[PDB]
Design a protein around this ligand. Structure first.
Ligand SMILES: O=C1OCC/C=C/CC/C=C/C(=N/OCC(=O)N2CCCCC2)Cc2cc(O)cc(O)c21
Length: 207
């Protein structure tokens, strides 16, 4: 298990998400689905130039899996996934600019729901989750587990759990007062409100 520090500006972003009083938390689901759709777009686009990129799985979809026993909401996609360098360095690097822009927009009157316009929507997970675990598999790398309870650090390790062929699974360990997002009717409402035209099938698992 390797432990890393977030870049200072991303630690600041996470603290702002965790500490700001902001009732409209449900948008976290739209931002993660949007990320999943973006990841699916990438593998699909690359597959047109190199069809062998789908040898690890042709299905392009998003599954929402609530588990009341574990108090987790899992968002599974079969997108492009993330390499180890993606997990530790690349996405963080790319996010520096968007985090800065987002912080500046909040100062000028934007609100937290607009986070996705800055390319850092993943961090909205911290509106509802005390800890987030991300399992991922990219064609060019091994399966990894990333995890963070914020506080300025994250971990990465090789994942020995069940193989996924390719994609990303975001496991939201929900805060104790955020269990509404395990309810079928609640998830259904939010997907219909915010994610109705996503161009991949979204399957809402029930319990
Ligand atoms: O695999 C994904 O993207 C790969 C292709 C890129 C697509 C653009 C949209 C993705 C935004 C993401 N931002 O993460 C920010 C970040 O530094 N982190 C550290 C590592 C763990 C994930 C979060 C990554 C991501 C998030 C997601 O909710 C679903 C996903 O399939 C992916």
């Amino acid at each position: 298990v390797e432990t890393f520090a977030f870049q200072a500006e991303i630690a600041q972003l996470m603290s702002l998400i965790i500490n700001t009083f902001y009732s409209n938390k449900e948008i976290f689901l739209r931002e993660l689905i949007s990320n999943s759709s973006d990841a699916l777009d990438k593998i699909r686009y690359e597959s047109l130039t190199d069809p062998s990129k789908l040898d690890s799985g042709k299905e392009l979809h998003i599954n929402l899996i609530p588990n009341k026993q574990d108090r987790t909401l899992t968002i599974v996609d079969t997108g492009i996934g993330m390499t180890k360098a993606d997990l530790i360095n690349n996405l963080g690097t790319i996010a520096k600019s968007g985090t800065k822009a987002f912080m500046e927009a909040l100062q000028a009157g934007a609100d937290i729901s607009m986070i996705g316009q800055f390319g850092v929507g993943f961090y909205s997970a911290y509106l509802v989750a005390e800890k987030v675990t991300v399992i991922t598999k990219h064609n060019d790398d091994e399966q990894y587990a990333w995890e963070s309870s914020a506080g300025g650090s994250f971990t990465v390790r090789t994942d020995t759990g069940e193989p996924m062929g390719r994609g990303t699974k975001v496991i939201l360990h929900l805060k104790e007062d955020q269990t509404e997002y395990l309810e079928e009717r609640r998830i259904k409402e939010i997907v219909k409100k915010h994610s109705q035209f996503i161009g991949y099938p979204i399957t809402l698992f029930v319990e």
